[PDB]
Each structure stands twice: as C-alpha cells, then as structure tokens.
Nucleic acid binder design. Sequence first.
RNA 1: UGCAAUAUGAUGUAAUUGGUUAACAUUUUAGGGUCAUGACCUAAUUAUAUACGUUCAAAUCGUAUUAUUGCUACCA
RNA 2: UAGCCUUUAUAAAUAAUAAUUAUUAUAUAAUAUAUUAUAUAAAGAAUGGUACAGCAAUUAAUAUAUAUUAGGGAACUGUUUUAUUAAUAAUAUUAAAUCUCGAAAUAUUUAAUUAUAUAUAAUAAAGAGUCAGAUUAUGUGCGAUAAGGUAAAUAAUCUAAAGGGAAACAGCCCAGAUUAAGAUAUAAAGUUCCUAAUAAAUAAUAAGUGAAAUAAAUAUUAAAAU
RNA 3: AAUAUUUAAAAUCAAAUAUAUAUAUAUUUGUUAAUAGAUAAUAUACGGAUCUUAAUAAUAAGAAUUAUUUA
RNA 4: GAAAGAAUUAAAUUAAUAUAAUGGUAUAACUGUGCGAUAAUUGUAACACAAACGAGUGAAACAAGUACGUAAGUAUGGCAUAAUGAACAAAUAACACUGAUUGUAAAGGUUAUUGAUAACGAAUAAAAGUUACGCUAGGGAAGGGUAAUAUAGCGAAAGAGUAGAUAUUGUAAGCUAUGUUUGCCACCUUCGACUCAACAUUUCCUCUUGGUUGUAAAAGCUAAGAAGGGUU
Lengths: 194, 119, 195, 115
Amino acid sequence: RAWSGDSPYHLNRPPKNPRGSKAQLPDIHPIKWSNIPGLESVVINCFVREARENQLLAITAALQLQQITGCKPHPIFSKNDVPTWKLRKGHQMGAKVELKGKEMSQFLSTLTEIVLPRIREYKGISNQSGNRFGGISFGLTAEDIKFFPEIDANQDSWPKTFGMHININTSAQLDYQARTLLSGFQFPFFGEEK
Amino acid sequence: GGLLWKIPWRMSTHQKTRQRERLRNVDQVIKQLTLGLHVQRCQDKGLTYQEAMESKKKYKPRSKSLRLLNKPSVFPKENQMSSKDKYWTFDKKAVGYRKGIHKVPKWTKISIRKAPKFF
Amino acid sequence: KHEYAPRFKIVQKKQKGRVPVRTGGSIKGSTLQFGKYGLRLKSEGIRISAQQLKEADNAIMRYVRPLNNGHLWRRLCTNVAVCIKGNETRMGKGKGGFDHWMVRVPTGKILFEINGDDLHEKVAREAFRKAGTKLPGVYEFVSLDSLVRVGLHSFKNPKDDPVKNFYDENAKKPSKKYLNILKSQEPQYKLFRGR
Amino acid sequence: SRTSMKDSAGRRLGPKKYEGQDVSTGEIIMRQRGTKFYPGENVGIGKDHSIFALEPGVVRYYLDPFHPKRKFIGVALRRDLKLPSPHFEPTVRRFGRFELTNKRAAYKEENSISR
RNA sequence: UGCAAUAUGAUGUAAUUGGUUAACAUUUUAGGGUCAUGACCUAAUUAUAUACGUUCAAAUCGUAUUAUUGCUACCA
RNA sequence: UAGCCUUUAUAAAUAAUAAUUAUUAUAUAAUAUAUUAUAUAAAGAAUGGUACAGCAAUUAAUAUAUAUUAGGGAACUGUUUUAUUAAUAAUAUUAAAUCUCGAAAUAUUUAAUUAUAUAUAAUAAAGAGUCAGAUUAUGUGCGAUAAGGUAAAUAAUCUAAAGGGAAACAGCCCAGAUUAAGAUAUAAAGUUCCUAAUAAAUAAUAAGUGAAAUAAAUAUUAAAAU
RNA sequence: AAUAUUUAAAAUCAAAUAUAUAUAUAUUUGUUAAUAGAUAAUAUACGGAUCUUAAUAAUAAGAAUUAUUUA
RNA sequence: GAAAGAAUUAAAUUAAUAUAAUGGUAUAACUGUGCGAUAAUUGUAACACAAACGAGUGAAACAAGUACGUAAGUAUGGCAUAAUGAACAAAUAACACUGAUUGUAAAGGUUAUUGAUAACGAAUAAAAGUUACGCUAGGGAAGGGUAAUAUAGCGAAAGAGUAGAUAUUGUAAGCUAUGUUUGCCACCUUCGACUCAACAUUUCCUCUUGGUUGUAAAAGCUAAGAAGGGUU
Ligand SMILES: [Mg+2]
Ligand SMILES: [Mg+2]
Ligand SMILES: [Mg+2]
Ligand SMILES: [Mg+2]
Ligand SMILES: [Mg+2]
Ligand SMILES: [Mg+2]
Ligand SMILES: [Mg+2]
Ligand SMILES: [Mg+2]
Ligand SMILES: [Mg+2]
Ligand SMILES: [Mg+2]
Ligand SMILES: [Mg+2]
Ligand SMILES: [Mg+2]
Ligand SMILES: [Mg+2]
Ligand SMILES: [Mg+2]
Ligand SMILES: [Mg+2]
Ligand SMILES: [Mg+2]
Ligand SMILES: [Mg+2]
Ligand SMILES: [Mg+2]
Ligand SMILES: [Mg+2]
Ligand SMILES: [Mg+2]
Ligand SMILES: [Mg+2]
Ligand SMILES: [Mg+2]
Ligand SMILES: [Mg+2]
Ligand SMILES: [Mg+2]
Ligand SMILES: [Mg+2]
Ligand SMILES: [Mg+2]
Ligand SMILES: [Mg+2]
Ligand SMILES: [Mg+2]
Ligand SMILES: [Mg+2]
Ligand SMILES: [Mg+2]
Ligand SMILES: [Mg+2]
Ligand SMILES: [Mg+2]
Ligand SMILES: [Mg+2]
C-alpha cells in the first residue's frame, strides 16, 4: 500500500506492507483457453526422524524413493536445531525427488490405481488441505508404501518401510480449481470445503 | 550567587529610546546600502547620478544577504516590530519564555529582531 | 496498563536532557482524540513522575467509576527513566540507581481525556480541577470546541491549517538525487547500464 | 565505584579535499568508513575505502545517471570540464609524459629493454 | 623451549633378572543364625593407563597418542 | 615538544583576510524546442544530519461492542453462542542521547573578481615565557533543571586594562591612557535636590504597589470579548 | 440586565507597507488591573531626602510609578 | 492467439559478512562453482590524511617473478575501523664491509628473525610496612553558597469525628518560607559547667477576642491582636 501524500516524510518512505499479510499475494485471472488448471510437478518429501541416531537408514529412504518414483532422489539434510528432539544440524535424514512430465504422470496413475485403493479406512484427500494458490498435499503412512509393486515383489529385501509426504503442484490459480482437476485423475475428496 | 550583579529585569524609558534609535540606524544602513547599488547599476546603464536618484524604477539588490535583509518578515524595520520584540528576547529557560533584551551580552551591538511566532 | 511502567527489555540510565520547547508550533498531542473533555498544561514545560500521574489518575477515576460507560484515556507515557543518588554521597562515582519514570510535557499537551453518557460538564470540570492540584504545573479544561494551545499565550485552530500534497510539490522543486533517478530511466541511460 | 572511561579517540574522517580544489597524484580526497562516496573519473580507492586522485585536475562531486542512489567523487582534467562527461564522447586523457630532447637521455632510453 | 617420573580393580594396595588381568578389599546375594554380629562359600571388577615393532611371547623395552608433577634455556 | 609571543631578512610573494558571481525558476527582447541579454523571485556552487518536525523501520505507550487463534465458566442444552482475558490483524493517537523517512540558520570549503599594500600569508637564522585560570551569555554530561559546585564546547572581558555607567563592584553595558589644551561632536547611563542635565502626548495605579536584586499554587474584587 | 466560558491579532476585524496599481495578492502590527498569599534575630534601608494635587488664588505645582511614544 | 528466451520494474541489505558496535554491500563486499594455492612475493617508494617527537593510515609510479582470465585486466592477505611494546644486553643465519704489526682469527658492522617491560613511551637484573617519640621545606594548591534532608505555612480534600470533610483532626501527591538538624562545594586552615547577658517572636504564663450539633458552668481544643513583666 502506497503512502498517501500529506506530509513531507513520504518522499522516500518505503511502501506499507499488505493489509493482513506480510507477503504480497498474486492476482486471480478468469479462466480462459490459455490458462486451464493443469499439473506441473510433484514433490516427494521424506524426513526419517529416526536417522538422528542411525544415519545408514537415510540411504534406505533414497532407495525407496528411487524404486517407487523412478527418478534420482536429492537427499535431505538437517537445517535447524531442537535439543528437545535430539535434533542436530548438518546431518542427513531423508531424500526428496522432483517429478515432472511423463514420470510424474506414471507416479500419479500408479498411486491411485494400486497404492490408494489398498488402505482399509481410506476416505480420500481432505478438502481443507492445499496452499491458497494451487497446490495440494497429503501423506502416506509407513505401511502404505508396502503396496507399491517394487516393494511387494521383494518383501524380503525391504525389512523396514516408512512414510513420506506428497505435494502436487498445479497451474490452478486457487485450490478449489485444483481439487476439481485432480478429481479427473481418480482422486477422492471427503471433507468439507472452506 | 553571592556576587551581586545588580542588573534589573526592566529597562528605563531612556534605554528604550536608545534601543529604538539603534534599530533605526541599522535599518538606515541597510536602506543606504541598497540605494548605492541602485545608483551604481543605473550609472552602469549610462544614467547620471541625479536621474538615478529620480528614476521611477529602483533596482532591487540581487545578493542573498541584502535581499533577505530587505524582507520585513526576516528583518523587520523598527516601525514594523512589536514592542515585545524591541525590548524582550526569547529564552527557553525563563518564566514566560522571555527575558530582558538588555541581559543579552553586547545587546547594543548585536541585532535580534525576530522571535518565534508563538513565543 | 504499562503507561507508567514501560517494558524496555534492557534498562538504561538515560541522560537528563531538556524538556522540549516546541518552537515550531507543533500540535501533536495537544488535541482531543479519544474523549469529550480533557486536561492540558498552561504553564511552561515540566516533567511529571509516575507517582504524580498515578495519583492524578486516581482522583479522576474517583469520578469516572460512579458513571455509566465511563472511560478515562491516558495520553501520556512515562518513557524517560531518571536515576537519583542518595543525598549523602560525594559527587562522582558514576551515575546513581534508577528511582522512577518521568515524562516531558510541553506547554500545551493534553494529559487525560474523559467521556460518558452522562457527564453534565460540571463533574468533568471538578474532576480535572482536583486532578490538577496533584500535578506540578498549571492546567485548564478543554472541550471539542476549545482552541488548541500552541504557546503560553497563543492559540490556534487546526482546521485552518492548510492541506497539501508533497509528491506534486517535489516535482515542482525536484532535488538533484530525484532528477538523477528520473534521468536514469531515460533510454540513453537504461539501455547502456551494462548490468 | 567502577566507571567506564574507555572510549576511542575519534577518527579524523570526512572530506579532505573540497569541490574545486586542485589536486595532484595520490592526494586523499576523502577518508570515510565504508563507501559513502564511490569513485568516479581519474580517481581510485584503497583498502580503507579512502578515495584518492589518480591524475592532476579539479575535484568535483557528482551523480552519475547510470548509478542512481550513489554519490561520486572524481577529478576533472580541467576547470571548465563538467565531470559527468557525456557517455558517447571521446574520453579526456592526459599524456603527461614528456619527450627526451637531450641526445644522451634519448640514447640511454632506446637502449633500455625489459629483462 | 628441552628433560625426567607416574596412570591396578569402583576401593587403596600387588608385582618385576618378561613368560599372571593375582589376592585383601567394595556391592549383590547364599549358608549356620531363636535372633543377630562375627565367620565360610559364591557372582562383577582389573581396559593392572594410550596404541605399534623385537619377543613362544608384551602393562614388565622404547617410540606415536595422552592426564598430573617437578628440574632447566629465554628472562628484556 | 607542539600551540600562543619576540628580533633580523628573502624574493620569480599576495599565496593572507573579507565579501560578490556560481544555482533554480518566471517575464520581456534577439538569435537557431534550444542559446544570449535585461528585470524579478527563491535562505542561491559542493559537504553535512543538530535545532525544528515526524512515527517511516527499531525501541516503547493507549483505546476499539472491529476480525481471527487459543484458554477457561455460564447459557444453549454435547453444539454453537455468549461472558470474557492474552496474542496477532485493522483504524486512530503518542516519544527517543546511542531513530531520522523531511529538514534550517550558523558552519566546512572551492576558482575568478573586487577591496584591504603605512596591509597580510609563507619561508630562513636566533630568543622567551606559559602548561594552577576566573566570571558573564549560550547548548550540554554529573548533581536534585541545587550551589560563588564540577567537566568540557563557542564568544567577550579580567588575567595583563586606565576612563564612563551598574551606590559600593577584577569577570556586566560602554569605551582602550604618547603629552597637552579644552572648542565641538558624542557611547553606555542619566536630567526634582544630594549630583553635571528636560519639556511634552495618550492610558493605568491609590497599593507608597513601585521608584536599578519582579516570590509561586491559590482566593477575593473589578474590566473587556463570546 | 441575569447566567456560563475565555482574556485570544492563530482565525476574524482595523490599520500600515511591497508588487500588479481605483481592486486584488502578499507581508507587518494591535487582546486586563488591584489586594491577600508575603515570613527572625545590632537599625527604618528605593543609595538618601522624598515622590500620587487643590477651584476660590499666587510672576508659579499637580508623579520623581507602570505601558507606548515625541522633541 | 499460443510456447520459449532475453529480461525489465517494484520490494529487499531485516538473512549474510571469521569476531563487539558503527558505516558499507544485491552493480553485492553475501552465496555457489572451475583453475589455483598464486600477490600471505622482491628492490626504489613520490604525494597526501594524521601528527609535538616516536610512531600510525591510503597509495600513484619504475623495475624482477608468479596465479587466474580468450581478452580487458585483478591480486603487495582478510568490506573497513581493534588483535599491541622503544632502546640496551644477548641468540640464529645471510652479505663480504672493517680485521688495531702482516696472514688468518677474535670482535664489530649491514640485512632477516627471537624472546615483554599490562603502572602497556617501558627510571634497576634485583625492594614491603610502622611512628601518638618523631624532624625539615612548603600548601591549606567555624564563616560563605545550596536546601536533597529538617522545621513551618499555604492551596485542594480522601478519611475519622454518634449525624456532617473543613469544632478537632487532614494519607499519598502540589506551591512555598527559614537556614534552627543530617548532608553537598571547597572561596576561606573545641563540647559542657560558672558569670553576665543583649536581640527576635514562629507566645509557655499573664492581657483582649473569634469558632467550638463536638462553648450548660468549671476546666478544655483551635485560632487572631500582644514581646510590658516572668519563664526552677
Ligand atoms: Mg520532539
Ligand atoms: Mg569514535
Ligand atoms: Mg616551547
Ligand atoms: Mg585571491
Ligand atoms: Mg545527538
Ligand atoms: Mg535525511
Ligand atoms: Mg592544566
Ligand atoms: Mg567555578
Ligand atoms: Mg598570574
Ligand atoms: Mg576596568
Ligand atoms: Mg585584550
Ligand atoms: Mg591607546
Ligand atoms: Mg517601596
Ligand atoms: Mg542612581
Ligand atoms: Mg496576522
Ligand atoms: Mg531591615
Ligand atoms: Mg570480513
Ligand atoms: Mg550492519
Ligand atoms: Mg592536516
Ligand atoms: Mg611525522
Ligand atoms: Mg573477500
Ligand atoms: Mg636495561
Ligand atoms: Mg674484500
Ligand atoms: Mg692483526
Ligand atoms: Mg660474525
Ligand atoms: Mg618496584
Ligand atoms: Mg599511646
Ligand atoms: Mg551557612
Ligand atoms: Mg466520612
Ligand atoms: Mg502529605
Ligand atoms: Mg505574633
Ligand atoms: Mg468555660
Ligand atoms: Mg507601657
């Protein structure tokens, strides 16, 4: 918000912060042919907290992300320091992979085809989830990852399995556009919207 | 404050007359300084001394100091000042925020014509 | 709640300083902005401690409390901290320990404000008069129709103060830096920056 | 009682050469902490961010439109020269070095080569 | 800066012309004990300091790594 | 030792001091939206961040039947709401030695010109004394916005300064003693007498207030304007 | 006349001045008094005397206080 | 109409900077990366800032060599301001400069480096107290100013006073007066008793008077005028 000119102190004053937020928010354009909500990337976040003691377990995360997603996993190292959690800064604990294009499409398909329709109490993705401007996230527990074809085939070589975070980025301007979009790719929703 | 500097807080009628005269003298010095510049410029244009004094147009000074000294707002003339400003000065550590002008060092020579608008 | 007890994280033994004499004729803090009646200083600038303001406040509240929707606004904060050594000490040995808080109130600053659905304009005048007897200056009574005081004997009505935009005024008399900034956007300078 | 009397003597900073002054090579035209004034033309800068002239001339304080929000100090090669020199004009250089007319001096210099 | 000596159980002590993780001892129990105490029997200890060559062969020799204490050179 | 003083001199010496022009804009005319001349206005070439002014960011303070989160009782009858409180958001109002988004005057300082030349700077050779300061005025640190207090900053005087004035008076207002005279101007200060010198105009005071060192909050009486 | 506020040249009004000049703009100046409160030690202490006016009536006095001025 | 690129504009120095605070930094001085390990080199250093001297700071330029970069060019340590110590006497090495009759040598000299005088311009390699038994040369290198404190008054009145703030009492804050107590500055280097007292009144008694649902009388409380006499 610009400074109204009524005093000789506004000439070089930096502008005020937005009304209710400390960060500027983007504009929302009407949907047209050029801009139609569509997918752009999918990011898998895996933070093995137990790696604080056994670092060797973090490697198993990279393998798990590799086998499932099929792309090279970029590792995740600590950044903060919480003594209450025995958390130390500068240690490897997990891996992440950026998925785009066809490989992301395969992941999304195999997630809804195989892994998702195998949880006993599954109801869908919460309608409350999602960044205000596009982007939807959910999470898979430790036991859900056993449902992937590449772990089910070699259960012997996968003694330990553990959950991860999923984030689907899309060209949707707002969340509700994304939810309608993702529903076309066989994604269920259960909660009540905002 | 044992030592006695018996300086009164008010002026006598005779000190006031002299103060008014001193202010007038300073104004007359300023009035004469401008007059010389006007006459000198007129002589430069070709005029003579007599017609320069009788010229309807009076060339105003161009120097910053003389231009401001001729502004009544900046340097008021004796007939334009208030009685308070003639005899009283502004001190921020005095009751009434004013003190006798005669208490200013070298008041006879120094010139203090302007005081803050509301003080 | 902390008007007379500021919560500075780090305590500092502030200098003595001097009570400002607003030579520029500023009216900031000298106008009613929260209530219907108020109290302000008439004499020269002075410093008021927390104890004096606390006790002046108690006098006013003695009349605000027996009222409906009665509010008292405190326009003054005891920002300055003053330290006083004991009398029985030689001069020197640094600065003494903190004792209380002060506030520098210029000639015409408003200290309190009152409002209520039934004030009658008489209890307000009595309350402020009594509260003034506990403070170290001379004060009077202000209302929405009262003129704003700017000096010991001079008054001013803020409505007559002109209103002007300064962005356009700057363009009328631009500064050297502003001209350079405007001149930098020119194509013969923006297209050859090399950045 | 314990009192803090430890205070460093002030550093004699500030402009040591004002606008219009005629300077020589290496003269310090400003000692400042940080770069409050950036170097301009025919002038250098040192470890202490001290600005010093590189060629004889006249010191001028100016603002370059290429670098808004940046004051400058330079050394115009001549009094009648405005320092923010036009961008697309040949730079004003100074040869400075003189010709060796003496025969012996010329002979020595011609027969003087790098190792 | 140079030099020398220690440093065994958790307890404080062994001891060595190498060829031993040895006992008193501390704690947990057991047994006789009307009941105890006091005896006798067990169970854990020693990184008998740090880490490597010669030695059937290394805590018994010195190096590399250490923790403590002392005597020396500089001392403007 | 430097700083402040003195003696003698050197020119390829004015380099010293002081001020003006510089800059922006308006109006008129000439020249090819620009240049020149003339007049006028503007705190007027370059550097700065004090007063003032302000609440920008930082540090603090106040209020909202405003909104959200969480806490708790009641109502509803476990729900939501209400009673609220702390925090944040929004609006409005404030201040500060170590805040300056705005910003003076003084100040630092530059080239040319002009004026001071019975005048300044610089330089060379030789001599000192001083290194306990005081008051007044202004802006401050300490003290208690106390001290004929203490510590610094700027200017003047005393120190080392006669004379006039403040009754008397080192430091305040004038004014600087070569020796005479005493005609004329006078500075500060005064003119009923002591005591050198006066007559007036318009209002107020009735208290000897006051008349050459103003004592406050408040109360009473009266006078103007709304 | 009674009652309640302030004692103000900021705003308004009046007047003066500089520019375009019968007008307008700009600048400058103009807004209460007395008393009580009232205070210690050799002796009243404006330096002292003393200073407020009065027609009948003098050649002739009528602040020597405060505020703004003149010659 | 669409996709990609070059990017531009606004905001930002609040993060980060080896280390305190301040100034600077996005054109980054901050971060990542390749080469590198080079300039964390060598002899002359004019000229300036600062400055009593000793010292300290920036650095153009000439010459030898090195690293990076296609090149232009950059590098004489760290974004800048702290991270320090004189001589004397000793110690180590290099130069080839003297070599006390000559030749060597010894010893000194030039160049480079070493060790702390922290009272940090460092009086020695090496030094604490007592004196009322004291001594010499010097300087002051109760009065006065102030009134925090103390005493007293004034303004307003919270609250007691059977009722009612103002018969009497009067929290805490405010405005003053005195210099009678405890202090502060340094212009100025004897408590008590006996005898005699003089002066002030902020009056203890005596004289006149106002108030006192708290003046029935008498005793009393408070206050005004009053310093003539008296006050173990
Ligand atoms: Mg202020
Ligand atoms: Mg400093
Ligand atoms: Mg000397
Ligand atoms: Mg000259
Ligand atoms: Mg300051
Ligand atoms: Mg600024
Ligand atoms: Mg001295
Ligand atoms: Mg003194
Ligand atoms: Mg002397
Ligand atoms: Mg004299
Ligand atoms: Mg003199
Ligand atoms: Mg003379
Ligand atoms: Mg009198
Ligand atoms: Mg007299
Ligand atoms: Mg006016
Ligand atoms: Mg007397
Ligand atoms: Mg750094
Ligand atoms: Mg910083
Ligand atoms: Mg210098
Ligand atoms: Mg030197
Ligand atoms: Mg660097
Ligand atoms: Mg020695
Ligand atoms: Mg030889
Ligand atoms: Mg020999
Ligand atoms: Mg030798
Ligand atoms: Mg000693
Ligand atoms: Mg004795
Ligand atoms: Mg005394
Ligand atoms: Mg009561
Ligand atoms: Mg009290
Ligand atoms: Mg009496
Ligand atoms: Mg009776
Ligand atoms: Mg008698």
